[PDB]
Design a protein around this motif. Structure first.
Motif, mmCIF file in Angstrom:
data_model
loop_
_atom_site.group_PDB
_atom_site.id
_atom_site.type_symbol
_atom_site.label_atom_id
_atom_site.label_comp_id
_atom_site.label_asym_id
_atom_site.label_seq_id
_atom_site.Cartn_x
_atom_site.Cartn_y
_atom_site.Cartn_z
ATOM 1 N N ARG B 19 50.928 53.045 47.354
ATOM 2 C CA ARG B 19 51.122 53.554 48.715
ATOM 3 C C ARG B 19 50.664 54.993 48.773
ATOM 4 N NH1 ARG B 19 56.071 50.522 49.595
ATOM 5 N NH2 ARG B 19 55.567 48.552 50.688
ATOM 6 N N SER B 22 46.671 55.110 48.489
ATOM 7 C CA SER B 22 46.094 54.681 49.738
ATOM 8 C C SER B 22 46.190 55.820 50.752
ATOM 9 C CB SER B 22 46.784 53.425 50.263
ATOM 10 O OG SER B 22 46.125 52.987 51.448
ATOM 11 N N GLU B 23 47.334 56.508 50.793
ATOM 12 C CA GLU B 23 47.510 57.589 51.766
ATOM 13 C C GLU B 23 46.480 58.701 51.594
ATOM 14 O OE1 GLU B 23 50.902 59.913 54.339
ATOM 15 O OE2 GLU B 23 51.504 58.386 52.837
ATOM 16 N N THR B 236 63.947 65.967 53.165
ATOM 17 C CA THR B 236 63.005 67.139 53.240
ATOM 18 C C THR B 236 61.728 66.900 53.980
ATOM 19 O OG1 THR B 236 61.706 66.651 51.254
ATOM 20 C CG2 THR B 236 63.746 67.961 50.988
ATOM 21 N N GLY B 237 61.215 65.682 53.950
ATOM 22 C CA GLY B 237 59.981 65.391 54.682
ATOM 23 C C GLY B 237 58.803 65.377 53.740
ATOM 24 N N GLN B 242 52.606 62.170 46.522
ATOM 25 C CA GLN B 242 51.408 62.869 46.976
ATOM 26 C C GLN B 242 51.255 64.273 46.356
ATOM 27 O OE1 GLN B 242 51.685 61.272 51.198
ATOM 28 N NE2 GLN B 242 49.725 62.368 51.373
ATOM 29 N N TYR B 255 54.040 74.181 49.767
ATOM 30 C CA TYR B 255 55.207 74.742 50.444
ATOM 31 C C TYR B 255 55.932 75.793 49.569
ATOM 32 C CZ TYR B 255 54.798 70.436 53.492
ATOM 33 O OH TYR B 255 54.313 69.449 54.356
ATOM 34 N N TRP C 324 56.112 58.148 60.401
ATOM 35 C CA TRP C 324 56.502 59.546 60.594
ATOM 36 C C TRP C 324 56.075 60.486 59.468
ATOM 37 C CZ3 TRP C 324 59.260 62.977 57.765
ATOM 38 C CH2 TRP C 324 59.617 64.173 58.390
ATOM 39 N N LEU C 326 55.641 65.135 58.546
ATOM 40 C CA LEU C 326 55.940 66.507 58.986
ATOM 41 C C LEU C 326 54.858 67.115 59.870
ATOM 42 C CD1 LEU C 326 57.522 67.867 55.692
ATOM 43 C CD2 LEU C 326 58.656 67.714 57.883
ATOM 44 N N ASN C 327 53.689 66.504 60.047
ATOM 45 C CA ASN C 327 52.729 67.068 61.028
ATOM 46 C C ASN C 327 51.505 66.213 61.409
ATOM 47 O OD1 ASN C 327 50.680 67.281 59.002
ATOM 48 N ND2 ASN C 327 51.933 68.954 58.194
ATOM 49 N N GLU C 333 47.164 60.223 58.616
ATOM 50 C CA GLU C 333 46.931 59.675 57.293
ATOM 51 C C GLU C 333 47.942 58.584 56.993
ATOM 52 O OE1 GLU C 333 43.912 60.689 55.412
ATOM 53 O OE2 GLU C 333 44.068 60.863 57.591
ATOM 54 N N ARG C 334 49.215 58.928 57.124
ATOM 55 C CA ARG C 334 50.266 57.940 56.947
ATOM 56 C C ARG C 334 50.105 56.734 57.897
ATOM 57 N NH1 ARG C 334 55.008 59.053 53.899
ATOM 58 N NH2 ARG C 334 55.362 61.207 54.481
ATOM 59 N N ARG C 336 47.171 55.256 59.118
ATOM 60 C CA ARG C 336 46.115 54.547 58.407
ATOM 61 C C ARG C 336 46.667 53.769 57.240
ATOM 62 N NH1 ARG C 336 43.977 58.196 55.127
ATOM 63 N NH2 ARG C 336 44.531 56.831 53.388
ATOM 64 N N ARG C 337 47.528 54.420 56.479
ATOM 65 C CA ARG C 337 48.104 53.823 55.299
ATOM 66 C C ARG C 337 48.991 52.670 55.662
ATOM 67 N NH1 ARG C 337 53.494 53.491 53.067
ATOM 68 N NH2 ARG C 337 54.065 55.712 53.125
ATOM 69 N N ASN C 340 47.354 49.411 56.837
ATOM 70 C CA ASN C 340 46.972 48.616 55.675
ATOM 71 C C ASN C 340 48.155 48.054 54.958
ATOM 72 O OD1 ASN C 340 44.436 48.100 53.673
ATOM 73 N ND2 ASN C 340 43.905 49.289 55.518
#
Lengths: 118, 404, 404
Positions: B19, B22-23, B236-237, B242, B255, C324, C326-327, C333-334, C336-337, C340
Motif C-alpha cells: 500500500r 503504490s502510494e 498524527t496524520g 512512507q 516535519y 483522507w 494531511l494535505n 496520491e492516497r 489514486r492508491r 487501485n
C-alpha cells in the motif's frame, strides 16, 4: 420421500447456507453435524391498495365492513404480534372492495388482508 | 531515485507496505513460501517470487532474498518486522550489493540488539535503565521515533501497551490515557535523546517501563517498524511507512517536532485466529465469510479476506483493527462497535474476548498496568453466542422432518 | 430514551445507520424488499422485516413502514436519504403515532422543498439567491449544518462538489481546495443564519453556487443527511449520524462552534457499478471477488461484499470510498492508491475513470467548476488493463493444447 430434498440452500437473516441432509446427519457448508428432532403433536397483493402486514400474527379485530369509504391513515385492522396488539392503517384512500380476513385468523406478510380501490 | 522494493515479509505488513509503495508510485515485489501462495500481499503486489517449499527458512535467509532483490531490479528492500528486520547481516549484505535497506545501519541494529551493549549506550547518554530486581507491575509506554540520515530526529508521541498477555501485546492505544502532557513531553524528548545518542536513522521505537513511583526505565529499542504503528499514524496524520522509504531515499524528515500534532485517541486490536476459551489455542483453518468493518473512525489492516485459508506455520493474526475517536469515552464505544462490525465466519477469534476487556470498568476508567489481564481471569468466561451456522442447521432439520 | 430504530432505507446508508445504532447501544431494524433479501444491511442489523415483492413500493410507502415501526417496538425512525427522507407526510405520520422522526419537523421539510417558498425564506433572512438567468460554470459549495431542538445551530465546514456529471455528483472534497479560510468562515456563518431563519432542527445541508467573481448564491436546502457526509465526518471527527439520533432524542448539540475544528483534506468517490466507456451504462450482475481497501487514510462505506449480486431495480452504488490525508498533494496520491487498493471482480466500475480525473493536471492544480467533466471528454478514453480473468483462460488454453 421422492419429493423431499436431500440438498438445498437456506437463506436465513441475509446469509444463505448450503445444506445437505442424510437423528439426521447434516452438512452446513461442508461441515457435518448430528441433529436430533423430537416431534410435537389467500390472495397475494396485486394492488398497492391491497392491505398487508409486514410481519405475521393473529387478527384481533376487523374495523371495517365491505363497501366502506376509507381515507389513508384510518385504523382498518388490529393484530397481535410480539406480545402486543397494534393497529394497521390504510395505505390508500377510497373504497373497501373485499375483505379476505376475519377475527381469529393467522396472517403472513405475503397475504392480502383487504383490498381498497383508490 | 527508488523505483522498486522487495517486501521481505509476509502476512499483514507485506500488505501495508504494498500500500505504501503504490502510494509513492514505486513498484512492489512480494515473496511467498509455498504456504503463502494465496496470501493477500501476493495478490496485491506488482510482482511476486517463491522462496522455498519450507514455510519459514526462505523468509529468514538473508542471502537469497538479496539475490532475488538484485536479480529482480530492486533498488531497495523493506524487512517489515519480525523475521530479518532486527538482523544486522541483512543490512550489511544489502549495503554491499547496492541495495538501500529501509532501516538503520547494521552497527546500531547490532549494538541495540545486544541487551548489555545497549544498556551501556543508554546509561552513557544519561538514561535510566532497569534494575536486576526489575520493575513491579509497570505500565508499558513506548515512543515512536523518526530519524533521517541528516541528523534530524523527532517523535510522534507515545503508545500505551500495558494491555498484554504472557508478554504478548493485545491492545495498543495512542496517546496514553494514563499520562500527563508533562509525562508525554518528557518521555518523548528522552526517546529523541537516546535515538540521537546511538546515531539512529529511520523509524524506531524506544520502550520504557513506568514504575508506580513515576520512574521511567528504558527496556528495549526496537530498530524497526512495529505492529502498532497504525495507532500513532491515526492520531498524527503522518504516514510512517512512507517516511521510512523517504529517509532511505536520503530525503530529510518532512516535519519538525513543532509541526507534529495529535488529535483524539486511537486503539488497535490484534484480531488473532485463536480461541481464548481454550487457553488461546490457535484456531487455524478456513475463513468462510468475511465482511470488513467500515464508516467513521475505522481502519483495517488485514492479512485475511473472504475464503482465505490461514496457514498453520506462522502467527495467528488475520487483521489489525484500528479505531479512532475524538476522546476516551467515544473511542471505547467505537471499539465495541467496530469489533461487532468485523464479521468473520469459519474460525474462532479474540473479538469476543476484547469486548469483555472494553466492558470492564478498570479499563474504561483508564487506569491499568501489565498485570491487568493476569489479574482478571474472568475475562475469558464470557457468553459465547450460539453460531448462526448452527441455527441454520437446526432450522433446516425442522424443514426436513416437516417434509418426509 | 431511544432504544430501537427503524432504518427506513436500503443499500449503503442502511449499513451506515446500522453502524451508528450499534455504536449507541440501540437496537436496529432493517427493511428489505425481496430483491434486497441478501443486502448487507439485513445481515448486519439486529432485526429485519420484508416489505413486499415489489422492489420499490414498500420503501416509498410511508404508512405501513410506520405500521411496522409501531408493531416492532421502535421508538424512532431514520429515513436515511432519497426515498422518504424529504417527504413531509412521514414525519407527520410518525409524530401522530408516537415515533421520533430523525430529521426536521415536517413544516420545514415542506417549506424548503418548495423552491419558491424556500427562496422567500432566504431572501427574507437576507441571503443572496439565484437569478432566472442563473450562474455560469459555478463551483458547487455546500455547508453541513447541525441544529438541536433547543435552538443551537452550528456548522461543520463546507464541501466542494464541483466535480459532477450531467448534474450527478461524482467526487466530493472537504474542505474546498478552492476557498480561503475567510470564505470558509463567511459561507459557514451564512449557512447557520439561513438554518436559524427557518427554525431548522437536526442535520441539514445548505447548498450554494459560487461564481467567477466569488459571489455566493443560495440554491437548495437539503433537509436530511447526504451521501457525502463522510467527507465532513473525516476532517472534523464528528459523527453526524450519531448526532442526528441524539438531537432526536431531545439532547443538546454535543459541540459549540468554537469546539469544532478540521484537519486535512477528505475526498470521497462514488464507486458505482457502471461502465464509463459505454456512456456510464449500468453494469449490474455479480461481484465474484472483492478485497477492501485498507491502511492509513482509508474509509469504506459499502453496500457490496464478496459474492453479492447487485439487483437492477435501484442505483448503481456498490460503495463510497473516502480517502483522507494531511494535505492536497497527499490526498490525491492516497486517492489514486485507494482506488487501485479497492479490488472488484465481476462488474465494470468507475474506478478506472476516477484515476483519469486524479491524473489530470487541472484537477491536481485544484481549480475547477461544474463544467470540468463536460469540458474534458478525453477522461473516458483510457487504457483498459486486460482482465486477469481473461489471462487465466489464455494460460489454461496453453495447458490444454500442451496436454493432448
Amino acid at each position: 420421500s421422492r419429493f423431499a430434498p436431500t440438498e438445498f440452500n437456506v437463506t436465513l437473516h441475509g446469509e444463505t447456507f448450503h445444506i445437505k441432509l442424510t437423528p439426521f446427519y447434516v452438512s452446513v457448508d461442508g461441515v457435518t453435524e448430528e441433529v436430533v428432532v423430537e416431534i410435537l403433536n389467500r390472495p397475494r397483493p396485486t394492488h398497492a391498495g391491497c392491505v398487508t402486514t409486514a410481519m405475521p400474527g393473529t387478527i384481533v379485530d376487523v374495523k371495517v365492513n365491505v363497501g366502506d369509504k376509507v381515507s389513508a391513515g384510518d385504523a382498518v385492522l388490529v393484530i397481535e404480534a410480539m406480545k402486543m396488539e397494534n393497529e394497521i392503517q390504510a395505505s390508500k384512500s377510497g373504497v373497501v372492495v373485499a375483505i379476505n380476513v376475519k377475527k381469529g385468523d393467522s396472517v403472513t406478510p405475503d397475504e392480502a388482508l383487504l383490498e381498497i380501490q383508490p | 531515485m527508488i523505483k522498486k522494493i522487495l517486501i521481505a515479509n509476509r502476512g499483514e505488513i507485506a500488505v501495508r507496505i504494498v500500500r505504501a509503495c503504490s502510494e509513492m508510485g514505486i513498484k512492489s515485489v512480494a515473496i511467498y513460501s509455498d504456504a503463502d501462495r494465496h496470501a493477500l500481499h501476493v495478490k496485491k503486489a506488482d510482482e511476486a517470487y517463491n522462496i522455498g517449499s519450507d514455510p519459514v527458512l526462505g523468509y529468514l535467509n538473508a542471502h537469497n532474498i538479496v539475490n532475488l532483490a538484485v536479480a529482480s531490479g530492486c533498488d531497495a528492500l523493506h524487512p517489515g518486522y519480525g523475521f530479518l528486520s532486527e538482523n544486522p547481516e541483512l543490512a550489511e549484505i544489502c549495503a554491499r550489493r547496492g541495495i538501500k535497506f529501509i532501516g538503520p545501519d547494521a552497527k546500531v541494529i547490532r549494538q541495540m540488539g545486544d541487551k548489555i551493549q545497549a544498556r551501556t549506550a543508554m546509561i552513557k547518554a544519561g538514561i535510566p535503565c532497569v534494575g536486576s530486581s526489575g520493575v513491579v507491575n509497570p505500565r508499558h509506554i513506548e515512543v515512536q521515533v523518526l530519524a533521517d540520515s541528516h541528523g534530524n530526529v523527532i517523535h510522534l508521541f507515545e503508545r500505551d501497551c500495558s494491555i498484554q498477555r504472557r508478554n504478548q501485546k493485545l491492545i495498543e492505544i495512542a496517546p496514553s490515557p494514563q499520562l500527563s502532557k508533562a509525562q508525554r513531553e518528557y518521555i518523548g524528548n528522552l526517546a529523541v535523546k537516546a535515538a540521537k545518542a546511538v546515531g539512529y536513522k529511520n523509524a524506531g521505537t524506544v520502550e520504557f517501563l513506568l514504575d508506580s513511583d513515576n520512574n521511567f526505565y528504558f527496556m528495549e529499542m526496537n530498530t524497526r517498524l512495529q505492529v502498532e504503528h497504525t495507532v500513532t499514524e491515526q492520531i498524527t496524520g503522518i504516514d510512517i511507512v512512507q517516511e521510512q522509504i523517504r529517509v532511505a531515499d536520503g530525503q530529510r524528515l518532512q516535519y519538525k517536532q513543532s509541526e507534529v500534532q495529535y488529535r483524539g485517541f486511537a486503539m488497535e486490536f490484534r484480531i488473532n485466529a485463536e480461541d481464548p476459551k481454550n487457553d488461546f489455542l490457535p484456531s487455524f483453518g478456513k475463513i468462510t465469510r468475511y465482511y470488513a468493518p467500515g464508516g467513521p473512525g475505522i481502519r483495517m489492516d488485514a492479512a485475511m479476506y473472504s475464503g482465505y485459508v490461514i496457514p498453520p506455520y506462522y502467527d495467528s493474526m488475520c487483521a489489525k483493527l484500528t479505531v479512532w475517536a475524538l476522546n476516551w469515552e467515544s473511542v471505547v464505544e467505537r471499539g465495541r462497535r467496530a469489533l461487532n462490525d468485523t464479521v468473520v465466519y469459519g474460525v474462532k477469534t479474540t473479538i469476543p474476548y476484547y469486548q469483555e476487556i472494553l466492558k470492564h470498568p478498570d479499563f474504561r476508567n483508564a487506569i491499568f498496568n501489565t498485570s491487568f489481564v493476569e489479574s482478571h481471569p474472568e475475562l475469558a468466561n464470557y457468553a459465547t453466542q450460539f453460531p448462526r451456522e448452527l441455527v441454520a442447521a437446526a432450522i433446516s432439520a425442522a424443514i426436513a422432518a416437516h417434509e418426509g
